[PDB]
Ligand binder design. Structure first.
Ligand code: CLA
Ligand code: CLA
Ligand code: CLA
Ligand code: CLA
Ligand code: CLA
Ligand code: CLA
Ligand code: CLA
Ligand code: CLA
Ligand code: CLA
Ligand SMILES: CC1=C(C/C=C(\C)CCC[C@H](C)CCC[C@H](C)CCCC(C)C)C(=O)c2ccccc2C1=O
Ligand code: SF4
Ligand code: SF4
Lengths: 141, 734, 300, 81, 57, 31, 39
């Protein structure tokens, strides 16, 4: 947290901005409150805070858990999409329904993405995620 | 059959395109009709000779001209202020204030300012008077002429080298890497200690007095006794002035390191010791291979080693290498590509080791010169590499045999090219998406009046490497910031002066950084990533595609393959080259403007604007785009003129050719022929002018030629304006 | 145009006597002046049962209200000449393109099957060299580019004149203090002046026109350039390249068992041309309306 | 003029011979498949580069190809003037 | 349909098969043949120092 | 200092050695 | 001016104008030559 960066608590220009900090929304405490919420980080001569990313508990949670949340949701959406696609093909109405979504079937697949990570891990160990270099017949060259 | 003779075919067509195609093949030799290898080899020998000859002529040109009508000595007297001279000016069409805004440095004729900067380098080499470079021109001229004649001689029958004489490599290897520059840097070192250092210390040593006077009073003592510290005698003092003796020195080979407190440049004795080091190092590197004599390393069979210590190998590092070492001796495009890539890389490195390590005196203070040189060299560098990639691509079609390389490392690369290009596309998409998202983040958040709701990153890896090299600014006490670690008693044996220098980060020596640098550096990453992407795509399609595999036989040529599926235009193996050229131009523009803004803020120390408006792009186009142009835009106007009118003309000329490029690029050859018909219809039927007729029946342009001319117009338009802008700004703001 | 750039060079060449305005080499559109004149004194004789002239830009008194102009007579000096003439120029070339496609629609001197084949088709193979863009709606493509130029410079001219010598403020003496100060007689004769003395005024606030209550509308002029470059990307490039990149991404997706059944295929060249020209026009017109909207807000 | 290239995949539907407006094809007697007469180019000198022919070839990887040469003339360029 | 030379002399290219059916005859002309697939194609480095085309194997 | 007719001299060294030497090195390759 | 003679006054036009003239004239008559000789 070095590099010549003053704490946002005691950076004079920080509170200087905080004084007439333009309260954005329809509540008078909007601006001031957020500046109060910006005492944990450490400002600089620009008067605005920089973010440190190291796992260092000074700013660890301020970047780690959002990353993990994104991984959660991206895994969910990718998993349910792939599962839906795999399911459609066992109907022999393939491209008919490619544009007409079968809602009574599209729902439970979406609702059943609860345990995507570890299940995916299983498909990794079972090897249920990849087809074989030559079995996949998509010809290169 | 006269023109063009080198192709009996092309002289059988009554369309003006003949001429157009007549002058786009005269330098593609192996495509001419009827010339086997040794013909090509020998005439390439001669033509390369001619190339270096005209290089010598160019050098003589510039040097004699500055010897004629310059102020080199008037630049000796008052160096840091007097401006150099390019040459005379002579044009009847000229303006009025031109003569009125040109004659300076005591001159009465229309002098032309100089910017390349040969004065500093030359005086650094130790020149004093006009006659010096007068004679210099006079003799390298005869050198050029003799070299030309040498080129002529080997054309005679009894002086025709052998193809085997060309294939044998190791002699050329040793002779070059030892006897081309090793001995040559030795000779330069001799010129340094005999002439350069004396002239630096104020003593004049001509072409006659050098025979009797010494480099060092202790000279020849450590010659053959081995106390080389004696030549490392009293170094130059802390007040010495070049060309003078105020606090002089009597040391020949020093290792002071850092800078000289007056010229803020590299020390000359460090230079001499450096050159000596690399000279002897290349000489010991000289005898490294095997010659015709019977010892050493047989290159074409060293890597023909598939056994050692029982466990045989697959090759060195345990990978196949058998059968390709003839190719580097078979093909020429291969060696050409390697050389081009190498050259471009080291040129970029050169362009990087200039603005921090001033090699010559007065380099740092004179901004315009070094700035122009930096962007000049980097621009030279960029598409120099594109040449390497293009010749790699053309090698892939012409010079390649299949069975000779069955199963070696090359084929194992081709077998998995797919994952390569896929992951490359992946990283490009990722970096682009996220950098643009963060940018637009900043834009909208600041577009609401609250900047605190906006993200600021902070790079620390470069901070760590900065302190770890020995920077103390950040106070981490690691690796020469820790003056007590294990390596804290090492480095240079004269690291105190280096430490005084680097601690004094007041000059251009590893300046601090912030979030913006994080941003733009990721932008560079993206740029080169997509550039190499398109280039390698074209390269690895030089043979054929999934939906067009035949093209290997169609050639590095036009093929269009008319509208089979929606069309197949731009599939011709250097369609990729155009795209790559665009993707390189914008990249180099990004980087050079980054450098420009950085150093501009460093000039007057006001770094606030950069760090303050680097986040959102409004700041980018508002703080530096038009906030420096009124200093240039009014070079001429309805009220007066300046010494910049020519530069505004530069601007506008460039813009014009730029848009002309668009004209050539968009419209295509299915419309520019219908009206040529009716326009031929005219001459046939008007009277008093139907007398004359056609040298040759005119038709519309060609497709590939249209693409080429459009690209040329675009690139020339891009080049000019930016140069004018940069030099005008630097010389107008300081 | 070459006359224009000739005068440009002369001004940049310290030869100002070779300029073409009133203070230099002469040319005066007498026809417009005389028609306006014969319009000035119309009532009484041509219009007996009529009280005032039809307008006040031809002739009459400067009609106004407050310190705010309503209508004053308009002056036609030297700069009018080349402006009207380049108007006519571009209209001529536009008609040229469109009528050319019109006549050479069914049969060309080389293609006798056009109407026998259609009017919306890309090309006819690399015969006779090239033949791409031989339909008619590509003629109208080029034509719409040109009419874009026409109308753009037309609105430039109109706005600049009616803010330079028609509009401003007024004093108790009827003293019309115009907004700009009559800049045509000064700079609307050379190219470098045309960029200086128009867009310096047309943008010098949009840079800072954001940042308060009745300013916060950060306009998408900063935003339209992006769509413009993204536009021009579609024009310069073919399609086979995109098709091959598509096939590679398909290979990867098929390796991970996510291959979309409906097989993607790249755009057809006419489709790509259409989307390119559409995005081009959109970006340009968005840019310009942002320009003069904010410019009027700076005075209205 | 330009060069023409023939293969074995000619099924013999003969849609190309009815498509080329330049009289550069003919079905010479063959034996291999049910075709018995395979297309070929006897009169290359009038080739035009329109290549409407292979667009009329239905065979997978259409049986005819045209290698577009470089020895063009007033005939291969097709000018009425 | 008749081609004419500059001298005023004429050529009779077509009709050569009556109604231009382009496939019917009892035996036909024979000049030049290439009945070979593409998988084995001509090569740059193998075919060199001459000016023949993609056909002679 | 600066120079005199000696510049006509340095002009005279050209047009025989470099001039026709380059002329021959050009015309060697059969226009 | 300086210690040189008039030369920079008039030696540009011939290089500027007449030498290009003969260059292009000779070139054009070259690109129409008969067979099989040519200079
Ligand atoms: C459940 C559906 C699904 C899944 C699992 C994937 C999975 C993948 N896609 Mg993808 N894609 C999908 C739907 C899906 N896609 C759809 C509907 C589109 C149309 C918009 C695309 C368009 C697309 C492109 C254009 C690219 C991918 C790429 C990729 C690969 C990189 C990771 C990624 O997700 O980038 C997805 C990226 C975006 C959605 C953007 C990965 C194999 C990239 C790659 O490199 O493939 C190996 C790539 O270049 N995809
Ligand atoms: C026909 C025009 C012409 C020619 C042939 C030259 C020739 C030369 N100029 Mg030059 N120059 C010219 C016009 C020209 N000048 C004009 C109009 C300007 C004003 C912008 C300059 C400004 C200029 C500078 C600032 C410098 C040169 C330099 C040079 C030399 C190196 C090559 C170079 O940079 O070319 C440039 C050619 C063009 C820009 C065209 C060479 C003798 C360099 C030098 O010192 O060598 C004496 C140098 O630093 N020139
Ligand atoms: C072969 C040519 C050559 C010559 C003439 C010199 C000459 C010199 N070197 Mg040297 N050097 C050379 C090659 C050469 N170097 C090469 C190839 C390397 C490897 C990179 C070095 C690495 C080197 C180091 C590391 C040092 C010198 C030092 C010196 C100086 C004092 C040497 C002495 O008397 O012992 C003095 C012996 C010790 C101090 C121990 C002297 C000027 C020393 C110096 O600068 O002066 C003190 C010193 O510290 N040299
Ligand atoms: C010293 C460096 C060097 C050398 C010796 C050559 C030499 C050559 N290049 Mg080359 N090239 C270079 C740098 C160099 N280039 C660089 C830096 C680039 C990138 C801008 C290119 C881009 C390039 C292309 C794109 C092509 C050549 C081609 C050629 C060959 C024909 C020459 C010609 O005028 O055709 C130029 C012909 C056209 C521009 C058309 C010739 C062997 C051509 C070739 O191989 O023949 C087909 C060709 O297509 N080069
Ligand atoms: C503002 C102009 C602009 C922009 C935003 C893009 C954006 C893009 N181009 Mg592109 N391009 C442009 C102008 C532009 N181009 C022009 C003028 C040309 C020359 C005609 C090209 C030629 C070109 C080629 C040849 C390729 C791209 C590719 C790409 C993609 C890079 C991946 C990425 O993350 O980018 C950011 C993505 C978004 C903003 C969305 C992306 C869609 C490459 C790609 O990814 O293809 C798959 C590629 O292969 N473009
Ligand atoms: C990549 C990291 C790095 C780099 C570039 C250098 C670079 C250098 N070290 Mg070094 N060093 C390092 C890590 C590094 N060190 C570490 C981790 C240690 C601890 C083991 C040392 C311990 C060390 C010693 C003990 C000495 C050097 C010396 C030197 C200098 C002579 C060349 C050499 O030995 O290498 C050179 C400047 C020598 C030197 O310059 O001393 C005068 C020397 O004596 N180093
Ligand atoms: C730098 C920009 C620029 C310039 C100078 C020109 C110049 C020209 N274009 Mg043009 N063009 C351009 C951009 C440009 N174009 C672009 C970007 C497009 C695509 C939108 C076109 C599309 C286009 C078409 C479709 C046509 C022209 C025509 C013309 C010619 C008009 C005759 C004339 O006044 O000569 C100008 C002479 C000087 C400036 C000297 C002229 C050569 C027309 C033509 O042939 O007219 C005879 C024509 O049919 N151009
Ligand atoms: C594609 C560009 C092109 C090029 C390079 C040439 C080149 C040439 N033309 Mg030409 N021409 C062209 C297009 C072109 N033509 C078109 C489109 C037409 C139709 C109007 C003509 C009509 C034409 C005539 C009627 C004549 C030429 C002549 C000539 C020759 C000498 C005149 C000259 O160079 O211009 C000089 C032009 C100016 C000075 C202006 C020269 C080989 C002359 C000839 O036969 O050779 C002497 C001649 O009498 N041309
Ligand atoms: C083409 C020329 C021209 C035009 C457009 C007009 C138009 C007009 N004239 Mg007119 N006039 C003209 C020539 C012209 N005059 C000439 C040459 C003479 C001389 C004989 C007259 C003598 C004349 C008289 C005596 C009267 C008009 C009137 C009128 C108005 C008739 C009412 C209406 O709406 O119509 C109308 C504005 C009448 C009116 O009431 O005007 C308002 C009216 O009383 N005019
Ligand atoms: C304009 C244009 C043409 C027409 C261009 C032509 C016909 C060439 C222009 C004619 C010459 C080059 C004009 C120059 C003539 C000089 C004035 C004569 C030189 C003599 C001086 C040196 C004295 C094409 O053929 C074409 C083809 C494919 C895509 C785009 C285009 C395209 O945009
Ligand atoms: S090439 Fe096509 S049209 Fe000709 S014979 Fe074969 S299948 Fe029939
Ligand atoms: S372009 Fe095609 S259809 Fe026309 S003559 Fe040639 S091969 Fe026959």
């Amino acid at each position: 947290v070095g590099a010549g960066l003053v704490p946002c608590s005691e950076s004079p220009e920080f509170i200087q901005r905080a004084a007439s900090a333009r309260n954005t929304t329809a509540d008078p405490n909007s601006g001031q409150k957020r500046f109060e919420r910006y005492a944990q980080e450490l400002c600089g001569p620009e008067g605005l805070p920089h973010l440190i990313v190291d796992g260092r508990l000074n700013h660890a949670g301020d970047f780690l858990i959002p990353s993990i949340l994104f991984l959660y949701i991206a895994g969910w959406i990718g998993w349910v999409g792939r599962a839906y696609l795999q399911e459609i093909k066992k109907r022999d109405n393939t491209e008919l329904r490619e544009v007409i979504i079968d809602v009574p079937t599209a729902l439970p697949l979406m609702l059943s993405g609860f345990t995507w990570p570890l299940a995916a891990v299983k498909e990794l160990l079972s090897g249920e995620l990849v087809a074989k270099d030559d079995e996949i017949p998509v010809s290169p060259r | 059959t006269k023109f063009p003779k080198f192709s009996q075919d092309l002289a059988q067509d009554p369309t003006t395109r003949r001429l157009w195609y007549g002058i786009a093949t005269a330098h593609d030799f192996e495509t001419h009709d009827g010339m086997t290898e040794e013909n090509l080899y020998q005439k390439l020998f001669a033509t390369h000779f001619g190339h270096v000859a005209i290089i010598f002529l160019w050098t003589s040109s510039l040097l004699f001209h500055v010897a004629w009508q310059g102020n080199f000595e008037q630049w000796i007297k008052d160096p840091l202020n007097v401006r150099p001279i390019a040459h005379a000016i002579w044009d009847p069409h000229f303006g009025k204030a031109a003569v009125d805004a040109f004659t300076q440095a005591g001159a009465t004729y229309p002098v032309n300012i100089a910017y390349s900067g040969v004065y500093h380098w030359w005086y650094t080499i130790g020149m004093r008077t006009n006659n010096d470079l007068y004679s210099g021109a006079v003799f390298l001229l005869i050198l050029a002429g003799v070299f030309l004649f040498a080129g002529w001689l080997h054309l005679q029958p009894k002086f025709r080298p052998s193809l085997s004489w060309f294939k044998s490599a190791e002699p050329r290897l040793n002779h070059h890497l030892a006897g081309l520059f090793g001995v040559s840097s030795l000779a330069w070192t001799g010129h340094l200690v005999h002439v350069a250092i004396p002239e630096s210390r104020g003593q004049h040593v001509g072409w006659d007095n050098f025979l009797t006077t010494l480099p060092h009073p202790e000279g020849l003592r450590p010659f053959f006794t081995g106390n080389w510290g004696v030549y490392a005698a009293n170094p130059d003092t802390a007040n010495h002035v070049f060309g003078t003796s105020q606090g002089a020195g009597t040391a020949i080979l020093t290792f002071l390191g850092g800078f000289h407190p007056q010229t803020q440049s590299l020390w000359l004795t460090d230079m001499a010791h450096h050159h000596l080091a690399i000279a002897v190092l290349f000489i010991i590197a000289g005898h490294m291979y095997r010659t015709n004599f019977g010892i050493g390393h047989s290159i074409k069979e060293m890597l023909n080693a598939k056994n050692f210590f029982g466990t045989k190998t697959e090759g060195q590092f345990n990978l196949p290498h058998q059968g390709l070492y003839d190719t580097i001796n078979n093909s020429l495009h291969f060696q050409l590509s390697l050389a081009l890539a190498a050259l471009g890389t080291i040129t970029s490195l050169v362009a990087q080791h200039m603005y921090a390590l001033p090699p010559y005196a007065f380099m740092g203070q004179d901004f315009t010169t070094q700035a122009a040189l930096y962007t000049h060299h980097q621009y030279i560098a960029v598409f120099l590499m594109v040449g390497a990639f293009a010749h790699a691509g053309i090698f892939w079609v012409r010079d390649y045999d299949a069975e000779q390389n069955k199963g070696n490392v090359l084929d194992r690369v081709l077998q998995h090219k797919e994952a390569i290009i896929s992951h490359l596309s992946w990283v490009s998409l990722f970096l682009g998406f996220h950098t643009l998202g963060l940018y637009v983040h900043n834009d909208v958040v600041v577009a609401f009046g609250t900047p605190e709701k906006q993200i600021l990153i902070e790079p620390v890896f470069a901070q760590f490497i900065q302190a770890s090299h020995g920077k103390v600014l950040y106070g981490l006490n690691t690796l020469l910031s820790n003056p007590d670690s294990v390596a804290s008693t090492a480095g240079a044996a004269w690291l105190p002066g280096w430490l005084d220098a680097i601690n004094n980060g007041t000059n251009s020596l590893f300046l601090t950084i912030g979030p913006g640098d994080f941003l733009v550096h990721h932008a560079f990453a993206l740029g080169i990533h997509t550039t190499v992407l398109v280039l390698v795509k074209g390269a690895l399609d030089a043979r054929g595609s999934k939906l067009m595999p035949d093209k290997k036989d169609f050639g590095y040529a036009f093929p269009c393959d008319g509208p089979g599926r929606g069309g197949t235009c731009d599939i011709s193996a250097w369609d990729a080259f155009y795209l790559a050229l665009f993707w390189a131009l914008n990249t180099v523009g990004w980087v050079t403007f980054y450098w420009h803004w950085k150093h501009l803020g460093i000039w007057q120390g006001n770094v606030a604007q950069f760090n303050e408006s680097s986040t959102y792009l409004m700041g980018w186009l508002r703080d530096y785009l038009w906030l420096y142009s009124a200093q240039l835009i009014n070079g001429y106007n309805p009220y007066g003129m300046n010494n910049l009118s020519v530069w505004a003309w530069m601007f506008l000329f460039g813009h014009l050719v730029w848009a002309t490029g668009f004209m050539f690029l968009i419209s295509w050859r299915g419309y520019w022929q219908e009206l040529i018909e009716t326009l031929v219809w005219a001459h046939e039927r008007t009277p008093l002018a139907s007398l004359v007729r056609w040298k040759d029946k005119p038709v519309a342009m060609s497709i590939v030629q249209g693409r080429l001319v459009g690209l040329a117009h675009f690139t020339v338009g891009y080049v000019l304006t930016y140069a004018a802008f940069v030099i005008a700004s630097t010389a107008g703001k300081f | 145009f070459g006359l224009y750039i000739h005068n440009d060079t002369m001004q940049a060449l310290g030869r100002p006597q070779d300029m073409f305005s009133d203070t230099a080499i002469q040319l005066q559109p007498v026809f417009a002046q005389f028609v306006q004149n014969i319009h000035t004194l119309a009532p009484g004789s041509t219009a007996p049962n009529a009280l005032e002239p039809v307008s006040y830009a031809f002739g009459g008194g400067v009609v106004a209200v407050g310190g705010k102009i309503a209508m004053m007579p308009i002056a036609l000096g030297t700069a009018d000449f080349m402006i009207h003439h380049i108007h006519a120029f571009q209209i001529h070339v536009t008609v040229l393109i469109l009528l050319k496609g019109f006549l050479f629609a069914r049969n060309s001197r080389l293609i006798p099957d056009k109407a026998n084949l259609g009017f919306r088709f890309p090309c006819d193979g690399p015969g006779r060299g090239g033949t791409c863009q031989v339909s008619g709606w590509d003629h109208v493509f080029l034509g719409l580019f040109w009419m874009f130029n026409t109308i753009a410079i037309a609105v430039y001219h109109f706005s600049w004149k009616m803010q330079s010598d028609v509009w401003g403020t007024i004093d108790p003496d009827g003293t019309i203090a115009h907004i700009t100060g009559g800049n045509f007689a000064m700079s609307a004769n050379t190219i470098n002046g045309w960029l200086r003395d128009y867009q310096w005024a047309q943008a010098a606030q949009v840079i800072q026109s954001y940042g308060s209550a009745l300013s916060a509308y950060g306009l998408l002029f900063l935003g339209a350039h992006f769509v413009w470059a993204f536009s021009l990307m579609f024009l310069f490039s073919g399609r086979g390249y995109w098709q091959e990149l598509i096939e590679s991404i398909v290979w990867a997706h098929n390796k991970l068992k996510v291959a979309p059944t409906i097989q993607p295929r790249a755009l057809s060249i006419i489709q790509g041309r259409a989307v390119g020209v559409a995005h081009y026009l959109l970006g340009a017109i968005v840019t310009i309306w942002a320009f003069f909207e904010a410019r009027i807000i700076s005075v209205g | 003029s330009h060069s023409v290239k023939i293969y074995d995949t000619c099924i013999g539907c003969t849609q190309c011979v009815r498509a080329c407006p330049t009289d550069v094809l003919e079905m010479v007697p063959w034996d291999g498949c049910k075709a018995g007469q395979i297309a070929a180019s006897p009169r290359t000198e009038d080739c035009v580069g329109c290549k409407r022919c292979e667009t009329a070839c239905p065979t997978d990887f259409l049986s005819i190809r045209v290698y577009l040469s470089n020895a063009e003339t007033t005939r291969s360029m097709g000018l009425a003037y | 349909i008749y081609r004419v030379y500059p001298n005023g002399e004429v050529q009779y290219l077509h009709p050569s098969d009556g109604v231009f059916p382009e496939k019917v005859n009892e035996g036909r002309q024979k000049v030049g043949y290439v009945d070979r697939n593409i998988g084995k194609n001509p090569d740059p480095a193998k075919l060199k120092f001459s000016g023949m085309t993609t056909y002679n194997a | 200092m600066s120079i005199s007719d000696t510049q006509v001299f340095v002009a005279l060294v050209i047009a025989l050695i470099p001039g026709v030497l380059a002329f021959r090195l050009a015309t060697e390759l059969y226009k | 001016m300086f210690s040189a003679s008039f030369l920079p006054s008039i030696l540009v036009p011939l290089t500027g104008l007449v030498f290009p003239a003969i260059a292009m004239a000779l070139l054009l008559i070259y690109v129409e030559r008969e067979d099989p000789s040519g200079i």
